[PDB]
Curated annotation (Swiss-Prot), chain B:
GO terms for cellular component: chloroplast; mitochondrion; small ribosomal subunit. The gene is rps16. One of its GO terms (biological process) is mitochondrial translation. Its main location: plastid. The keyword Zinc-finger does not apply. It is found in: Plastid, Chloroplast. One of its GO terms (molecular function) is structural constituent of ribosome. This is Small ribosomal subunit protein bS16c. The lineage of its organism: Eukaryota, Viridiplantae, Streptophyta, Embryophyta, Tracheophyta. Pfam families: Ribosomal_S16 (PF00886). Belongs to the bacterial ribosomal protein bS16 family. Component of the chloroplast ribosome (chloro-ribosome), a dedicated translation machinery responsible for the synthesis of chloroplast genome-encoded proteins, including proteins of the transcription and translation machinery and components of the photosynthetic apparatus. Keywords: Chloroplast, Plastid, Ribonucleoprotein, Ribosomal protein.
From Swiss-Prot, chain C:
GO terms for cellular component: chloroplast; ribosome; small ribosomal subunit. The lineage of its organism: Eukaryota, Viridiplantae, Streptophyta, Embryophyta, Tracheophyta. It comes from Spinacia oleracea. GO terms for biological process: translation. Exons 2 and 3 are cis-spliced, while a trans-splicing reaction is required to link exons 1 and 2. It comes from the Eukaryota. Signal peptide: none annotated. Component of the chloroplast small ribosomal subunit (SSU). Mature 70S chloroplast ribosomes of higher plants consist of a small (30S) and a large (50S) subunit. The 30S small subunit contains 1 molecule of ribosomal RNA (16S rRNA) and 24 different proteins. The 50S large subunit contains 3 rRNA molecules (23S, 5S and 4.5S rRNA) and 33 different proteins. Belongs to the universal ribosomal protein uS12 family. This is Small ribosomal subunit protein uS12cz/uS12cy. Component of the chloroplast ribosome (chloro-ribosome), a dedicated translation machinery responsible for the synthesis of chloroplast genome-encoded proteins, including proteins of the transcription and translation machinery and components of the photosynthetic apparatus. Keywords: Chloroplast, Plastid, Ribonucleoprotein, Ribosomal protein, RNA-binding, rRNA-binding. The gene is rps12-A. PANTHER family: 30S RIBOSOMAL PROTEIN S12 FAMILY MEMBER (PTHR11652). Pfam families: Ribosom_S12_S23 (PF00164). InterPro entries: NA-bd_OB-fold, Ribosomal_uS12, Ribosomal_uS12_bac.
From Swiss-Prot, chain D:
This is Small ribosomal subunit protein uS17c. It is found in: Plastid, Chloroplast. Component of the chloroplast small ribosomal subunit (SSU). Mature 70S chloroplast ribosomes of higher plants consist of a small (30S) and a large (50S) subunit. The 30S small subunit contains 1 molecule of ribosomal RNA (16S rRNA) and 24 different proteins. The 50S large subunit contains 3 rRNA molecules (23S, 5S and 4.5S rRNA) and 33 different proteins. Belongs to the universal ribosomal protein uS17 family. Component of the chloroplast ribosome (chloro-ribosome), a dedicated translation machinery responsible for the synthesis of chloroplast genome-encoded proteins, including proteins of the transcription and translation machinery and components of the photosynthetic apparatus. The chain holds residues 58 to 135 of 165 of the full protein.
Amino acid sequence: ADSAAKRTRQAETRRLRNKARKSEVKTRMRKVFEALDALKKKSGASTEELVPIDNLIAEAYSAIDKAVVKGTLHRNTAARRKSRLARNKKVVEIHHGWYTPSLAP
Amino acid sequence: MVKLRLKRCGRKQRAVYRIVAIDVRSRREGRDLQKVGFYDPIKSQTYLNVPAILDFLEKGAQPTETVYDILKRAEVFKEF
Amino acid sequence: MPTIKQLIRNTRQPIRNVTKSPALRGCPQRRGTCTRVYTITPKKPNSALRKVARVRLTSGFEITAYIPGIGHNLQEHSVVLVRGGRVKDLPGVRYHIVRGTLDAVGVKDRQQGRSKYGVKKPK
Amino acid sequence: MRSMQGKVICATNDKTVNVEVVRLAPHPKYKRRVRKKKKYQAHDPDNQFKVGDWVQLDKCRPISKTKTFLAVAPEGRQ
RNA sequence: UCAUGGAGAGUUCGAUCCUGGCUCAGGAUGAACGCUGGCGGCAUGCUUAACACAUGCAAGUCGGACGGGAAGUGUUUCCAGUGGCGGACGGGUGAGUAACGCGUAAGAACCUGCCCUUGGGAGGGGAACAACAGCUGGAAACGGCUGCUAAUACCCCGUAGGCUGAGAAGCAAAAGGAGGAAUCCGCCCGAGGAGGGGCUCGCGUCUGAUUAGCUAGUUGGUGAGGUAAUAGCUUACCAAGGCGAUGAUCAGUAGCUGGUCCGAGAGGAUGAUCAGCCACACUGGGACUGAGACACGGCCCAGACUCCUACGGGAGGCAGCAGUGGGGAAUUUUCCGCAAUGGGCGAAAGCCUGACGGAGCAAUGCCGCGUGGAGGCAGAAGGCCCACGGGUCGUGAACUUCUUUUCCCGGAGAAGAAGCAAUGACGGUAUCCGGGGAAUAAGCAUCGGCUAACUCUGUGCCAGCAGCCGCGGUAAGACAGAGGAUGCAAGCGUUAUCCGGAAUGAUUGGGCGUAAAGCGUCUGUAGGUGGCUUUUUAAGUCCGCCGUCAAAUCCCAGGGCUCAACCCUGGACAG
């Protein structure tokens, strides 16, 4: 080709990293989506509370998995992962804040 | 960081140089926290102000080539 | 006008040095296109036939400019170069025309003060 | 810097007070001492200020667009 | 002691005093035009159309990250591609922006690759994607299946002074390369610092009331989200707030500041080069990666415009440097060089820099220098004027000698370049030495008053001049010519813009009986100013100390260019 490209080389790599980061930030949105979804269900109609937390904790661990994994690669600064893990445990602390775990400062 | 570097300060065909410790992103004739040094390559002195060069090199502003070479003429280098 | 409140509202301001040439409005002298090369008379105390070229300018105005010197080449639709300076005798003529510049020749046979009329040296 | 002491105007907003701040200033060209008023929105989680009391403004983290101060109390050395 | 600064004149009227307006004398231009033009030193060189742009160049680099192939015949040079940083710096313009954009001064809610300091870590696996080979589509631009490959390229498991959470609990990383080794460059996770950014706020920041109401995510509150971080940043609900006659909103103008110019001073105008911050990159709008952009020479879309096409489609952004065309009164060379300086990359070697260093043209400006020095019978030739005696051009010239800044003809010849040597575009430039030779070199305004310089000839209210007053109808100190004189000098004048003068917008510094000007008078709101004594705080005020107001400029004093201009070093009042 031409003897010097230098910027189309960039835009090629930008297309690639657009694909990877677009994709795996979407994985993060899907797993946080499932965690908040099942939390919404056990807020709605569960009727036994301290037992089924193992599933919510399991998927929440997958949420903390892909969250912090995408914290390692440069697509999320610190205080992005902090704000969203703190978001998920705000939601968990609210679902237990309505009910049977009693928490007070 | 900061990079201790000369800057041309004179007429045409004169080359009276200052030694300024400015940030490396600036243009070559910008502004400094403290303009420490002097270098007159035709024939004259070179005021150096040793404590301030030891302040910035103690901080870790690496110099350029010939600023480092002026710093190798005198015995400025102490690692303390 | 007390120091208190009739004057820390405002005194007033004088306007500007009002422009003594409303055309030429960038800067000093400006290319012109001759439209009429007629001749008018001054006010009552004088008596002459002063020969002015009403000239369209490249600025956007049209203005009647005086023609100095004795001889003049200026026919219809020639190109001149007007400058400022008020001829008193003529109501309306605000401007002069430079001589010796583009398409307006120097005056005929003048040997005293040639830089005002665009005539090169003899001898 | 200094605080900005001044009267409370109207507190019909929760945690929020408008404050007149009266400031003398030398007018530039003519040498008097013209007052200029400028009123602010201050913060109070206690909201323990009625109309007409006078507070001191201190800079803090911005709470809203205008609410960039919280006022506590003056010293009161008379 | 301080003081280093303040000028008038013309014109109203038969005259006088006065008010008042105009005009001039002074500086400055990024200047333009006219006449004239020797050199040198240092600056400056589209103010207009942010108007289109032909051509070349303006951003690369790394083989010591990796795989291949292609010249050279164990050995090396290259290379498109995947990667690594750099393309967010440097350069250009001022269209917008009357606003935390800028200037100055504080603050907390943040980020930060390269850079220093510092605590710990780098086991194990695995899948491809370019390249490439084949087929094939296209005029090109680009592609598309089929297989294959490597890594500091991607993915998974373990492990972590980190994170989430009240705890419980969980969650998260790595990369090798060079070298015989030694070791070095790295990588991952932390913790600081410097510098760089992102925010917030006090104060300062143009005119217009013949623009008086504006604002409904609007101003608050909570909850949910969001951002690197606070935030109506965003959304649902609640509250009705918030701004404004001290000018809100609207309209118009304008990049801002160190500064420049003027002024005695207070301050008035202004923001070229120099420097800092902002914004834009054909007109609009988006997002992507990275530490950092909503990116001038990146991507995607829309709009307009130019080029190519084989008619299906492509390609493009000079407000980078040079340059062309247009507009304009007017603003240059399609130059040389990376030698320095400063960037970017690399372990080094080096490479690339239209930044920058130089060169060319232009009296565009500021400064320096020359066009001769000394004598020259007081005799001649001539112009102009004359009471015809003469005067004046005029020591001027002619003429005799002296000298060579410059000019020509030759020789030498730098530093700038950095202690390993080598390394110079400038350039055989600067400078010096020698040989002729006064040789090669003065113009332009003005001469009625301001305003220094005046008589004569021609013209006869004509031609004309003119900054204001006004000259010009037969003897014009004002037009035109000559002589002479004046002031300047490689410049001299006119014009335009700005300040002065102008106390003619007045704080310093004006006025209102009659000159321009007191509301028709009165009540009174906002607001402004306010009696005396004693006491208290100190907001103003004053004093000390401290921080800052970048550097450059101005002021003082030194120093360097043969001086000056200019450059450099140090210092500081103000405020």
